[PDB]
Amino acid sequence: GSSGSSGHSGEDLPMVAPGNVRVNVVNSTLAEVHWDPVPLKSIRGHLQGYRIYYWKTQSSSKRNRRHIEKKILTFQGSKTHGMLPGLEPFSHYTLNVRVVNGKGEGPASPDRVFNTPEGSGPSSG
Numbered sequence: 001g002s003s004g005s006s007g008h009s010g011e012d013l014p015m016v017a018p019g020n021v022r023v024n025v026v027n028s029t030l031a032e033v034h035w036d037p038v039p040l041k042s043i044r045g046h047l048q049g050y051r052i053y054y055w056k057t058q059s060s061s062k063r064n065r066r067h068i069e070k071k072i073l074t075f076q077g078s079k080t081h082g083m084l085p086g087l088e089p090f091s092h093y094t095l096n097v098r099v100v101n102g103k104g105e106g107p108a109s110p111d112r113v114f115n116t117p118e119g120s121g122p123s124s125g
Contacts, residue, residue, distance in 0.1 A: 014099045014106025016042040018050070021097060023114045028089035031114050034081045035097045046102045049076035053108065054084065054095035089119040 019036035026032050033052060040047070052073035061067055073095075075082040087093060092115045098108040 012044040012101070012103045014043050014101050014104075017099055017107045017109035018097050019109075021109050021112050023084075023095065023112050025114050025116055026083070028117050028120045029085070029087055031084040031087065031093070031116070032081055033084060033095060033097065033112070035109065037078060037080050038099055042106070043099060043101050044103070047078055048100045048102055049074060050079060050082065051075070051098045051100055051105065052082060052084075052095050053098065054093060056088070056091065057094045057113070058092040084114075087116060089116045091116050 016038065018038050020034070021036075022034040024032050024034070035050070038047075052075070053070060054073065055068050055070045073082065073084065084093070084095065092113060094111050094113050096108045096111040098105050
């Protein structure tokens with residue numbers, strides 16, 4: 001076989017994703033992800049931001065419009081941590097970090113997990 005043709009010229013694009021990924025749950029509804037500040041050599045050009053993809057785990061939609069809600073988070077500029085607000089308590093979540101530059105994204109780093117504690121607020125039933 002082959003599978004080939006198409007070429008390009010230009011297109012600087014990123015190459016690797018951030019080191020030492022971790023996440024710390026902060027509040028019942030708020031977590032804080034951590035990652036390493038990648039080299040410009042991997043960014044190739046001008047770092048726009050970190051994006052984070054994440055989804056609800058341990059809910060599992062089932063039957064009625066069965067899919068997984070795969071949400072996105074936006075941290076422009078060269079942070080090394082970024083919060084997950086507007087989540088749920090007593091739930092598992094999965095997320096991953098991706099670099100973005102002036103040309104596009106590159107790869108996403110290894111996925112991570114966090115479970116949120118229990119709750120807080122005027123719950124009753």
